[PDB]
Coordinates of N, CA and C in Angstrom, one line a residue:
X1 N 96.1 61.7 88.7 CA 96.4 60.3 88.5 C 97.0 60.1 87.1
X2 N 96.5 60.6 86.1 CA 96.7 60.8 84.6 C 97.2 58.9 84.1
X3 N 96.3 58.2 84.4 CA 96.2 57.0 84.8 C 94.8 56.4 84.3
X4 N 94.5 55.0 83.9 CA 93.0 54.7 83.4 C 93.2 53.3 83.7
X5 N 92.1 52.5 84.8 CA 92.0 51.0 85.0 C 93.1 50.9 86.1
X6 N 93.2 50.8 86.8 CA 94.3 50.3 88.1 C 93.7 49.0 89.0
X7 N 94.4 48.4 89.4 CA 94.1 47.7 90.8 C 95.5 48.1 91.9
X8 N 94.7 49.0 93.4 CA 95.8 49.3 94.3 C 94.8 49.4 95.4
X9 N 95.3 48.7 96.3 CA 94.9 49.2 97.8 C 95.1 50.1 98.7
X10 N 94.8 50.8 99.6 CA 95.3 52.1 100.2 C 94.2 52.6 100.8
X11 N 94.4 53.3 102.2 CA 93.8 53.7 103.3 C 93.0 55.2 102.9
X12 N 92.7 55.7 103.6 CA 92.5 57.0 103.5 C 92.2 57.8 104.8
X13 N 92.6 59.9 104.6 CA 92.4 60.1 106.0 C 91.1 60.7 105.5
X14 N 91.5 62.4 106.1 CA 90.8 62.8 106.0 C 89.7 63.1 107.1
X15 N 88.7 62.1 107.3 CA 87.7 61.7 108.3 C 88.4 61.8 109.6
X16 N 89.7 61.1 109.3 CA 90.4 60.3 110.8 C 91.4 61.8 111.2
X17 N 92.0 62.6 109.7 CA 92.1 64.1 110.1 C 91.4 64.8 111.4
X18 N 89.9 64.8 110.9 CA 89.2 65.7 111.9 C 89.1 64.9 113.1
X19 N 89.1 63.6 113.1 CA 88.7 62.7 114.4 C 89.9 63.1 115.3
X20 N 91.0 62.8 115.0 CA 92.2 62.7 115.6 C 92.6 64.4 116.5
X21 N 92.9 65.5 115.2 CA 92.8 66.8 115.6 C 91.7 67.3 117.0
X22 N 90.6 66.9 116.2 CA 89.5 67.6 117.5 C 90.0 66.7 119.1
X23 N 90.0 65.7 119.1 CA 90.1 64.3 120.3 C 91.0 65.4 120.9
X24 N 92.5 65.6 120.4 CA 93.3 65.9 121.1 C 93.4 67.8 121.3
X25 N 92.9 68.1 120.2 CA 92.9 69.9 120.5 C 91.5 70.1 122.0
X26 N 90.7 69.0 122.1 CA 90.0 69.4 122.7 C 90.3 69.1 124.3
X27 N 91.2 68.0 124.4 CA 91.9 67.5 125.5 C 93.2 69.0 125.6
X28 N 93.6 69.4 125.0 CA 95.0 70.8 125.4 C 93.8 71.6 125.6
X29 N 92.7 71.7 125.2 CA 92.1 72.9 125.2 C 91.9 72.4 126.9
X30 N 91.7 71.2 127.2 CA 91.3 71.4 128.6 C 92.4 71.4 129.5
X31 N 93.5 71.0 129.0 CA 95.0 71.2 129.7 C 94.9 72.9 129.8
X32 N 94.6 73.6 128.6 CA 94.7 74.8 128.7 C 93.5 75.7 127.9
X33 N 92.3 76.0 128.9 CA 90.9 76.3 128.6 C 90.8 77.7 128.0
X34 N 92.3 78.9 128.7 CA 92.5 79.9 128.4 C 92.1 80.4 127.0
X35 N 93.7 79.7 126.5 CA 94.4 79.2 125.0 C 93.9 78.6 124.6
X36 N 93.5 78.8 123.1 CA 92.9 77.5 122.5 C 94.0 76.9 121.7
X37 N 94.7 75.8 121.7 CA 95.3 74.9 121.0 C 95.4 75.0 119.6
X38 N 96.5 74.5 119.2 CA 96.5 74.8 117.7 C 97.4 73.1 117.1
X39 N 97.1 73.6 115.6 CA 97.6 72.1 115.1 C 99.5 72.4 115.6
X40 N 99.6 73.3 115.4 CA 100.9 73.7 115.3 C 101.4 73.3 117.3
X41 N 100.3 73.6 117.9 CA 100.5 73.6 119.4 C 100.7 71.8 120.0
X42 N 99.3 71.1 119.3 CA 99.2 69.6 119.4 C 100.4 68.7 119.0
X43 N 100.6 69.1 117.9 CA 101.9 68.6 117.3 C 103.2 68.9 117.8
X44 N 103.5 69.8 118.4 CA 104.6 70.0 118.7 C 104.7 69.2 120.3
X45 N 103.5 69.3 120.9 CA 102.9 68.1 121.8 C 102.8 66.6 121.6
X46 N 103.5 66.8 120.6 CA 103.2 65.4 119.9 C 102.2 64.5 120.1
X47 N 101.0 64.9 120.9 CA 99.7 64.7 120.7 C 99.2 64.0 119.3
X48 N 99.4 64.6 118.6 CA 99.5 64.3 117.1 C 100.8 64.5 116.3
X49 N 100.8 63.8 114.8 CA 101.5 64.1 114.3 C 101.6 64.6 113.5
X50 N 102.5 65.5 112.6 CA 102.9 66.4 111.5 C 101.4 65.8 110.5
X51 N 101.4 64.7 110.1 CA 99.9 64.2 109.0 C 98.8 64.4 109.6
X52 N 98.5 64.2 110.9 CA 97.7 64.7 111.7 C 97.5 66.2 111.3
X53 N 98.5 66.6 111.9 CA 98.9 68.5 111.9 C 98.9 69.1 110.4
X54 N 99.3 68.7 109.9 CA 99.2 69.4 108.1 C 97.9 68.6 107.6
X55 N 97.6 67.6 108.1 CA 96.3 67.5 107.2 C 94.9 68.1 107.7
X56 N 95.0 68.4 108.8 CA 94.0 69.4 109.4 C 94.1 70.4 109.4
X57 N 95.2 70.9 108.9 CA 95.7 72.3 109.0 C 95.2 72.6 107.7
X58 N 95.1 72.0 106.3 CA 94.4 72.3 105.2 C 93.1 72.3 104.7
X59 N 92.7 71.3 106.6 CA 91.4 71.5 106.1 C 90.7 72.9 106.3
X60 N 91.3 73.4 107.5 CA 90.4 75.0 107.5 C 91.5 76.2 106.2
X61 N 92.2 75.6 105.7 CA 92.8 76.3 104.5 C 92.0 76.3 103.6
X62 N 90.7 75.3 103.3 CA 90.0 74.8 102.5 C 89.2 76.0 102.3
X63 N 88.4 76.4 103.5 CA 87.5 77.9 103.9 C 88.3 78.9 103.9
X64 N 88.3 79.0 105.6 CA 89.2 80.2 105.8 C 89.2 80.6 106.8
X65 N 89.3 79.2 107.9 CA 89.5 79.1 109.3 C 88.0 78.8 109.6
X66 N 87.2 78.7 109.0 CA 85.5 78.8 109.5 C 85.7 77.5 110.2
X67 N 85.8 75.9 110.0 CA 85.6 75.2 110.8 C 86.7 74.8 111.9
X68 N 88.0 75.3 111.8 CA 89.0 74.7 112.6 C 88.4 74.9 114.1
X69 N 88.0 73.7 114.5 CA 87.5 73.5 115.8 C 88.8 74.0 117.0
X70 N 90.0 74.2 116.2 CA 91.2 74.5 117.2 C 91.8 75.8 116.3
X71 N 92.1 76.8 117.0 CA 93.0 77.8 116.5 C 94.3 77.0 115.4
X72 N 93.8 77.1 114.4 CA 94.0 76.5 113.3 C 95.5 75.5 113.8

């Protein structure tokens, strides 16, 4: 921020990251039970989108794949 005292309003993900990713990786996963879905797979499904997809995609960047409920 390199910033001190603000007033701004603004949303945030994150939370709605994992909500959004899991909803729909778990619906491909049932389109396709085989394969597990990926952010890269949803998205291109347009299922979700790229903010969706890159912001969940950082979250198992965070670890190291330990939670990505979908093949990353």
């Amino acid at each position: 921020n390199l910033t001190k005292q603000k007033d701004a309003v603004s949303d945030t993900g994150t939370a709605a990251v994992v909500k959004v990713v899991e909803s729909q990786a778990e619906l491909y996963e049932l389109k396709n039970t085989n394969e597990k879905a990926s952010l890269s797979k949803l998205v291109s499904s347009g299922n979700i989108s790229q903010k969706q997809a890159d912001s969940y995609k950082a979250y198992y960047g965070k670890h190291s794949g330990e939670t990505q409920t979908v093949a990353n």
